[PDB]
Design a protein around this ligand. Sequence first.
Ligand SMILES: O=C(O)[C@@H](O)[C@H](O)[C@H](O)COP(=O)(O)O
Ligand SMILES: O=C(O)[C@@H](O)[C@H](O)[C@H](O)COP(=O)(O)O
Ligand SMILES: CN(C)Cc1ncccc1O
Ligand SMILES: CN(C)Cc1ncccc1O
Ligand SMILES: [Cl-]
Ligand SMILES: [Cl-]
Lengths: 550, 550
Amino acid sequence: MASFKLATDLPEWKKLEETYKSVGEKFSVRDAFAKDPKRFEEFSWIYKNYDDSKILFDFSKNLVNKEILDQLVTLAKEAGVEKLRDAMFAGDHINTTEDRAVYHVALRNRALRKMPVDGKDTAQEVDDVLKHMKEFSDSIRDGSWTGYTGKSITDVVNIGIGGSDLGPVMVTEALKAYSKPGLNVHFISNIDGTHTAETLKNLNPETTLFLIASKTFTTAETITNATSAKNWFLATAKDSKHIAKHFAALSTNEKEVVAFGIDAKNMFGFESWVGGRYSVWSAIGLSVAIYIGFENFNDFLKGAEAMDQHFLTTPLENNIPVIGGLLSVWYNNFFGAQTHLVVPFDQYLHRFPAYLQQLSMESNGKSVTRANVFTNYQTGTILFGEPATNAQHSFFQLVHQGTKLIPADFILAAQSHNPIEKNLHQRMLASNFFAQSEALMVGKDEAKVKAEGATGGLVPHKEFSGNRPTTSILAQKITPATLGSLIAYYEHLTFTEGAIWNINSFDQWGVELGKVLAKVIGKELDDKKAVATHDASTNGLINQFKEWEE
Amino acid sequence: MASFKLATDLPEWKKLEETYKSVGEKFSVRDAFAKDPKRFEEFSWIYKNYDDSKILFDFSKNLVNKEILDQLVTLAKEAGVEKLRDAMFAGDHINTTEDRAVYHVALRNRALRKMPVDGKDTAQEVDDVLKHMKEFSDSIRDGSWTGYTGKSITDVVNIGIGGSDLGPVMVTEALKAYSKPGLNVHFISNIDGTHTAETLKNLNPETTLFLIASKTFTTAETITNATSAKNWFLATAKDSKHIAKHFAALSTNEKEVVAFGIDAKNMFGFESWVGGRYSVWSAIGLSVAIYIGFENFNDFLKGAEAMDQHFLTTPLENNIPVIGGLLSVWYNNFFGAQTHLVVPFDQYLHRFPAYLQQLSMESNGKSVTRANVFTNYQTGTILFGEPATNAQHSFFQLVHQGTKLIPADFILAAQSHNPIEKNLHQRMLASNFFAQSEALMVGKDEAKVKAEGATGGLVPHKEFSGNRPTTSILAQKITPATLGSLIAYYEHLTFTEGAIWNINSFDQWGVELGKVLAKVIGKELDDKKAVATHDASTNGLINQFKEWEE
Ligand SMILES: O=C(O)[C@@H](O)[C@H](O)[C@H](O)COP(=O)(O)O
Ligand SMILES: O=C(O)[C@@H](O)[C@H](O)[C@H](O)COP(=O)(O)O
Ligand SMILES: CN(C)Cc1ncccc1O
Ligand SMILES: CN(C)Cc1ncccc1O
Ligand SMILES: [Cl-]
Ligand SMILES: [Cl-]
């Protein structure tokens, strides 16, 4: 099914190795700007969203020029990025190891284009779930859906883990400006009983709604947590008939939902072709629709749809997510940089790096290609980040003066939702965004340090290399539509990387393994008898725990 | 001045390069356990805290054996780790570029040992500040300190950034079990006005106390934020005489505190020899003393002091923070692993990786040695993480099946503060801790994948290499004392790495530059005139921002 086996044996890969040696390794971004008066225009692109809002993607402080980008585009052609993308959008089963379609793009098909899986259009089935989400979220928000004592819901608790948790977390944080007073969202995800205890501590069963978010509806942590929540609820409500007003399910598995005691009328469904890390667009985003309202959730979907259309219809050389993915390959595979940093200059987006860390690393942390052979090259990068300006005071020291190349994406909105003090804070925030990427590029040489007053041995400690690359992403405003487009940009960047490496970006056998590993040891923790059934470390740790546990 | 110039000048560094090729590169941990029945005992150590509680540090699933560890210890001797450590504890000015002592260890000197800077003991000066912290925090907690309308304080807001923020955040989250209902803590740190707006939205000026946390008391972000808080307060209170009941300062700069309008009686001092990322033990920890009580905060200090005593007095071969630091150097410098993962199996510790990311990367992200020459070897690693079990469902995919070595530390308490359902959740959490480190070691070979039912091209996709290293840290319970010892473990690990590399772990010239960069561009943002004073990218981003800003 694959058209090639190994990225390293694409003809352009060895050409890029040669370009790395002659041009890339010692690339001077300062010299690039000096050579090319049109560099900013040539290496920046304006994305226009469906609502005519705009996002500037400026790649011009990267270690890249026309020659390098053209070679990377050739590599993408040789790798059949476009063929794989088209197959994704056709509903083909490109998740080859689970024999599944990969159809998050269908979730945000608000245009109702024909988008078939197994030869049947999905547009109406997706739309019908959205209709249900709108009805229900409207009823929560207008008080027509009351708790078992006729009170409006005040608190919504999502219970889920991984893909069934982190999108809801990140997007409700990101779009918190769009929420209403008195209607709050909460998250229980960890099996650690602290998460249950602390989240429920101050909540009222009469005014709390639970969403049990689980694709399979069999995940140990989620079902255990959901049982705990049901117990807490019934401790006050007493009668199980009242569960129908307080528990809903977001799932693909109706039989297990109903077995759990949730009415099928209170199930919001989705399909197997929605990966967890691509799921916030589905029924899994119900907490978002409740928190900010369905219209805002729908605008978020439409932002993703617009970026999908950009990705599908734009030649590679001007295709924004492809460009980002090509740069990632350049750094990962030619420079040997193992990490990718994402820094929102935006407090609402504080969980955006963690969300991307799941999307990226879970997709692309693979060692086997679509030809079912092991790679002889690096795949997925380690993605990390925190918001600025905080990050500037902390690990930015190492970004500026350490020994590791750390490609970084900085993101700013031109307009704040909270423009206090006639935009005093916002102008200060913006000034940091510009100045930090400028400093990473320009650096500060020995002569400048001397001129500034340092002498003798102090001088080298105050030098900065510069030529440290960044990508700057400037939005007008982080609206629902903008956020939709930004997530989809990273989805399709991730797609591009995986396509070049010839991996399946859409399975997760290490995550699936983790969901079956613990039960064997759990059974050994039912008593305090020493164990010797494992390696000596695992035995030592279990046995020490048995001595120290309650 | 330094006893050697470059780590590469030390004879054992070249010997380790040879050991890496002969034994390390292909190291089999499975074979190591099969060869050595005492391996768990030989590569695990029990730490005993001042309160007779215990922490097990199990390094036996690392890519290490007796030969390797003996060589790394020799390298520590050659690098003069012990000499530098002793100088640290002696109060010598080992922060050579700022000409400062490095004396966070003096902040937790509850035994009142003689600990002099510039030949003058610091014990009583440190202790006097702690007396003041105890008196003030007790008065907040018991209601004897009232707001300007005669009400007890309900909410305490710390305003500060970087080292003046993240310790307070992480430690109050970690020790939240020790808090009391009705006395909450909050943090404003980002310059982004969202942080101010969202934090203050539901607070009452009459019952809110602000702590303005700033070593210098000049940081742009903090003073801007503090001024916004003052203005919010005065909008309600009216008269500045009322500030004295609602604002305190945590600082080294009395003149600037008083200039801001805070009474010197409400200043809690510290000295220049406390680095921000080592400051939560000082007056900067006041929010912790208020939230959980001074006695708990003192027990936290005593845990650090006990780990200090361990680091100072233990031969290198059994010195727990040194062992951790030597393994980090092994992976960073000989395997070329760029990252270090920390995963607390503990929801309260969810900000622990972020705190350690600052400690580590801001200390050790340096390219110049104490002999004032550039390193052409790797220094600080990129540290990241998130809590388990969540992480198991996300980026653990790449940990298990990607192409990058990611040395990982897993941390579990045997006892939960929230042992709900007769410890059902806690046994489940623990089972995951043991099972994940076991699986990273043993992996899953081709034969086992076939036996489990896969055929043909599916098989390689479900294989796991194993021999992926972990360190397991098992505490009895994450009490204040335990957390103190755990942070000090990472401080001294960080110390060890930097001593081997011969860098100054205690300066931060990139963070310092950050604090003076934005001012030029901030003045350019005072109008909407196009700018041409920078490189074309910086100009283009500024100019697009001016078109899109309010
Ligand atoms: O990325 C993944 O597949 C996981 O993080 C899942 O979302 C997680 O295990 C929860 O699975 P489920 O939604 O089936 O409960
Ligand atoms: O690590 C550092 O030195 C910084 O993060 C500082 O803590 C931060 O810049 C705040 O400085 P100050 O405490 O002087 O306000
Ligand atoms: C005509 N549609 C836009 C109505 C509608 N609204 C929300 C969800 C689905 C749906 O069909
Ligand atoms: C003698 N000391 C233990 C009393 C004391 N308590 C708290 C802080 C300082 C201090 O001296
Ligand atoms: Cl629509
Ligand atoms: Cl004491």
